[model samples]
Target chain A: GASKLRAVLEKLKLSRDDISTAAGMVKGVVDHLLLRLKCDSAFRGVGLLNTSYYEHVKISAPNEFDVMFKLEVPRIQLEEYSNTRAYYFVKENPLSQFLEGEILSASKMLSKFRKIIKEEINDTDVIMKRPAVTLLISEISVDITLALESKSSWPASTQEGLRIQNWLSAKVRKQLRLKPFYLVPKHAKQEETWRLSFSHIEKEILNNHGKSKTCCENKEEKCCRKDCLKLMKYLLEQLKERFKDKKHLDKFSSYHVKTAFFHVCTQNPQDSQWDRKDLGLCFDNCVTYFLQCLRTEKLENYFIPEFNLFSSNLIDKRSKEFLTKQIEYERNNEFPVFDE
Target chain B: GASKLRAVLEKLKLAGMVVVDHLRLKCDSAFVGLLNTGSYEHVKISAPNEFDVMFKLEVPIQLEESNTRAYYFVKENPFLEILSFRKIIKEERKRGGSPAVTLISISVDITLALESKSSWPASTQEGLRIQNWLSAKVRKQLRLKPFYLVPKHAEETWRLSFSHIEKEILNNHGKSKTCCENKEEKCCRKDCLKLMKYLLEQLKERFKDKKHLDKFSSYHVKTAFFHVCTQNPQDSQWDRKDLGLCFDNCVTYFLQCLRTEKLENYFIPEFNLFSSNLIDKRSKEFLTKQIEYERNNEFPVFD
Candidate 1:
């Protein structure tokens, strides 16, 4: 974005920084790209899924909330994942694979919705427009999606947006420790990193007696106070833009709100510079309390699942900033994949 | 749409008499045309279907309404107006053979939606977002409403003005309603018409209402009405600056309050000239009395 602006400014014989003093436009984009380069899996760049490999995924009906929270049973990995549904795109295309996965995700979504509707209101007959599903392999492969439509061609975004909404619904369902488990793909993961080596926030979680789903022992999950503080500062800054009103972000209970606040902080690695204290307080705030919130919830619920789709590892600000840029230039702007 | 100045002049120039101009545009490029056609159908065209079946009836359901008012029961009754749901397009080719015909009609988006399972209350966040963002390309047929003297009479043709078509296209990108944009509104019409037609044929198997249905007849009416009403010099109009930027304030009030899809179905035929006119009065009276009798338990189910 700044590049285009810079081009325009150069054309007009003025410095690009004159328009907006904050380096955020250039910095944010660069950081996002760098994170993608180091942490993103090979699957992120591939637009089409290989047909043979794609078929390898098993298809079945899933129990709700299996994707959002990680559940592990050594004896049976797939079986333990309650919502174990699989579907395939007709082609071995990456975009199709993404869409097919979404369909499976949507299937879980609808099935979960059916269960919730029955459980909550107990009236299953309420009428609704069944969300439309379309899996297109776009010509512009930068992950640009349709977000709006007019009366005639009520764009299919409503359906995709609905899919996003189902996930949000799942977030609410799981946070309150409510029945009918909720899952978020972004939170699903199987790997764990060491305790002391954890982000500074992990130490804080330890002090708080918070458990970590990413690590084995409950102590391993606690906050590393330094990391937690840095993360918290970063998050407050980012959030102020979209959630400036400071209205409680969730509809869940107070406990749920706290858990969500931390989860959001620890989960987003967009600004990966707290380790070196170079990227300002935003990084510290983003990690510390968020990790604490995450660990706290894990200890409270043993069987609950959580996804570990964080896009990066602990890093000094310089590497973080540079990597973020590299990732963007290589893959464009789409970022659906998450590697633990 | 091109004659914005004229639209302003005409709207300002005219009073008392209701103007019934219709416009047609591609759902994408010319969305105005489609909406205009919708209004035209409401005021001018009454699509109808009639059939003559000489052979014995071989259907599952009957073609008549029973003496019931319960929603499901009414729903269960197979509408036999299937033949009436014929395509309105003119065919260049001449076909030789003619099979027995049936009649059907569809006037709203929600009648079939009744069979649907998903719906969002209009008051919800997502619902409000949709309502606010969506550029409604609906055809609204406006004529003088029935007064004490007229009883029930509307203009023969409707005037359709295209608004928000281009704005929606640009704002919404390649996601317009027209065929150029990926859409199934046309497909919905074709499929629903066929589904009703098939259901009617099935109903014909068990009961016989061919005589009455044929006698009564049906029409396909579509309409589009802009959210704005009461044109004035201050209304914000495209071609002419004569109309003011009429308060979008009403958007939260009356305009948003009404459900066009639902109102078009029950209100149009009931309140329009169809029920109050000279020719349809007798048929209308019979249907009304029958419905009322059924409601009061004065009527019995058809055997």
Candidate 2:
């Protein structure tokens, strides 16, 4: 069916200019986001590359439920978070209920799905981990098959899909534990809102674009470094304030705490202050200071941009645009099209 | 990596099929007793083990509201009791109005019957300590998966299970309405006798001067004067005694004394003495001793 469709598209001979324009639009939106990430001084570098392609199947019925399933995930370059992270995430929307004794096609579908994920999981060497990307196949019921493509180097076609499947599977399994059956991975619909926290490079690129934005006066780029600094400081403070008040915050082992901190702060290229050994030593003091503040109840509010209607959140207009363009270029140009 | 899987399997040997779903059994109201005898002497009135075991299962456990001495019995062989007493002693842990105890020793018997009590092998006597056995099981269960998977994925181990049809359902709902329980044919008498003896002895012990017992009798009569308070408003059983009201005064008296003695302070100490103890044995022992002393010194009796 897909090959026939491709053949038809080829014969139509759609306007090359229109296709190029559409591609440009897609690139533009992604680049806009990246620029925002780069404008923030705390960040270091940002790069976007084609990761992988995900193939999924969605099943729906009028009165039953719907599911977004991972038919396959092919990773050319990516890594799974952990072994547990390598299971499928099956999500159900609005939750379907059947009579106690009544057998429904939905139930059978879900059972088959579970069996499928289990079989497919052992078929590969994907280990579990806390991750993102869940593929669920659903019909009357839902089954989960998670795979996250490794983001290392490009993958061979056959290996790419399998690797993506494994990576997504691992992440789905980990996230499913903390979610409700409705929010399960299999049910996730494709939308930007559901995307994982933007990768470090992605965020920095976005910030950079924001910094390069042109001022209303059409002058040199409006400097917003001070506002950015204020926000970053406030974000850290807010995190401390919230975390310290939680009963479970202090329950983790010291090693866990240290590891979590390092993990969270180091993942993104934006927080380069945390990565450098020399700078890391100083940053450690900052971390310790924040921990102390949490203990001493001295944290202050660190609200986001819109929260301060009274204050100006500025950016060097041109620099912001430059960052935006870079993001757009990557988003539009870097992704792989597994579709025929 | 193959060796890793082997290591995992070997680690599981430590847990040796420790019950996971079984842990969900909520702690409900239970009466318990701890007896340490210097020597075996009693052929005194005792219920047949079969009857005792069956009643333990069938009897409804009401909170302090019970008139029958509804207790969760813990009996250990003398030597086992000596060796593993620390691990199995039930200590009173009061959280709001709910009270429960940790188990010091556990027998393998799961069937609901009175005679099964005999199966409670004296663990300490055989050098079977609970901590050693339970520790291994806990470690095995805890270390089931690797570090990356442990914190969140442990619940998967219990997602699938095989159980008797009804037991499986009960395991999920936390309620049992089995055939035996619903029919209610054989009347349990073991606890009734214990209650009667306990009440009669209480009369002799606390009312030594007769005035106190007389005062209680008058109070009871006056309450009867208010129409023989027999309807169990809570459960709708006939001729039920208001044991909750009857015991409130004594309970309050003891609570006040403890409060005055500042015994309610310092949660950690209280937890160690009461909450963390294996079972409510320590409290049971104190109650048993108090009851015995009261009977010896104050109650009317033909010993």
Candidate 3:
């Protein structure tokens, strides 16, 4: 993530040149795909879903890239299948005829959306869905998703959700809620309900998640939220390779840690709780909270309270328990995953 | 609400008391006192508004069984009697309709119910089917409790109040113990109610100029919720995690009942809550159309 200065995260600290090259190589192809997608009447761009390499938390820096590629469509409706209220079924417009019924088919969207991804970036083992077009740009991973942007309003399901008031401000919360929400075509439950992508707001909140306006902006008053998040991400990544074969830690994602980290942010919202000097304490706490969620098997989406992040399908009981044990072991053993 | 808003409601109700004092000033008011009712009393899901306050009558009243099954004649006033509470209060507009003149300034709809230590009505024979969810002990205890009667539009008649029984069941809702008490164990019943309530309010707001949707009250939502709760009787069935689906499930049942125009009063099967006399034939069709549109449209009125 590099050297002695970057020893806190090990190789996760990619040097500036490596990151720049990784980003540059992907951008050339990413830009081409965007331009190509734009030629079609549907695709519109809403910029990066916050490139991880640029965000720089050691939780990040895969050669992987993401762009919030928007699709312009006529007025439509979103029907939520389950009240977990995370995913929704976008009703159909006249544009989609047979494959999509009265309901907008996510399969239809991905089937068509993935074709565009294949045509632009020639030959590199393309993966069909995040539901994003995942591929490699000269061995650098990139995933630009198919996003359908809504008007400046959020679903009512999120009315009592987004517990960011104490962390951010109501003004900021309202401002973000009023911003356009996007839905990504994810093949899940109903196969019609698209996943609500608050990736933009998530990025925005992650960038500004501090009690004060001058959070990371202040030189003397730096916060450890980023430091702790990075450390946690790095620790999980290390544990990943260490236990990939034993397979106890399968399906464990950096996003899970990040989501739990966001919960941690809300709970201990005071700026003083995040003094950079308390990085170790902060990191340990985030790890512990992640473990708690893992143990209980009930981590919720940061935006949608009903959508349990720890779905048994996402992470089964055995793996979750094992992962929790391993993580706790790493904590107790002073990070053996970091020894290498 | 946090204190300031609570204080605002307090002031509004106190102003309501001012009007009640005027009635006492004009006529030696038999209005003993008002008991707070409605959603404000039942569940504080959404914002606290639209209060229902019922005044208790200590007067010795005789309920003469009327031709209408659940309704009764006020036998206390034996000979020719005319209703003059509205005239005594001197409400300018027509007071021919039942509810006491709304002190519209404070948005209070005052109604007085004759609290009787009497037995259940014959109509209630079909009601109180709590043996399914609640045990016979609780059901029998509920029956032993005092019943209530509110004045009807008929000069002689009084409508039996099922209000208090409803309040009891709502608090003690759910099939199991510690249902709403435990966090993870909590049921989505309340949230389902909230969503349906919000859905109806939004649809009502949609036809602001036309008051057709006004007939569709929150009680209809409450009644349907109770029936769903009875039919599906398990707390696990309405788990909090399934809040969105639970709401959808609740609304769908309500719409079906609406389309059938036969949401029977849970307390009285003979009393069709959606009878043409209550929700007009035209209003029922319009309401169903609106509900379908909202349900199909994912309730953009919420957005």
Q: Give the TM-score of candidate 1.
A: 0.22
Per-residue lDDT tens digits of candidate 3, residues B1-303?
123322332433432233443446234534355544222242223334544456666544556664566677755421236222556556432433345765553355667666767677777887777655654545776898777777765445677777888877876676443456546557767656666776777777789789778788887888898888878866779886666677778888998898888897788878788987777878878888888887777666666
Q: Write the per-residue lDDT of candidate 2 for residues B1-303, one digit (tens) a residue.
A: 123222322433331232312322334332121011111111112211111100112121111111111112222111222111111222222221111122212222121221121221221122111112112222232223111000011101101111121122112111111111223311111222223333434544554664323212211211211111111111222111333232332333333322233221110112111221222444334433554554345322312
lDDT of 2 by residue, A38-107 (tens): 4432111322333211111211111111122222122221222222222222222112232123211223
TM-score of each: 0.22, 0.17, 0.49
Per-residue lDDT, model 2, residue B80, is 23
Which residues of candidate 1, in runs, are more than 4 Å off? Answer: A1-235, A238-307, A310-340, B1-279
Better of 1 and 3 by lDDT: 3
Could you give the DockQ of candidate 2? 0.00
- Each prediction's whole-model lDDT (CA): 0.23, 0.25, 0.67
lDDT: the better of candidates 2 and 3: 3
The lDDT, on a scale of 0 to 1, for candidate 3 is 0.67
Worst 10 residues of 3 chain B by lDDT: B1-10
Interface RMSD of 1: 19.6
Q: For candidate 1, what is the DockQ-based docking class? A: incorrect
DockQ of candidate 1 compared with the true complex: 0.01
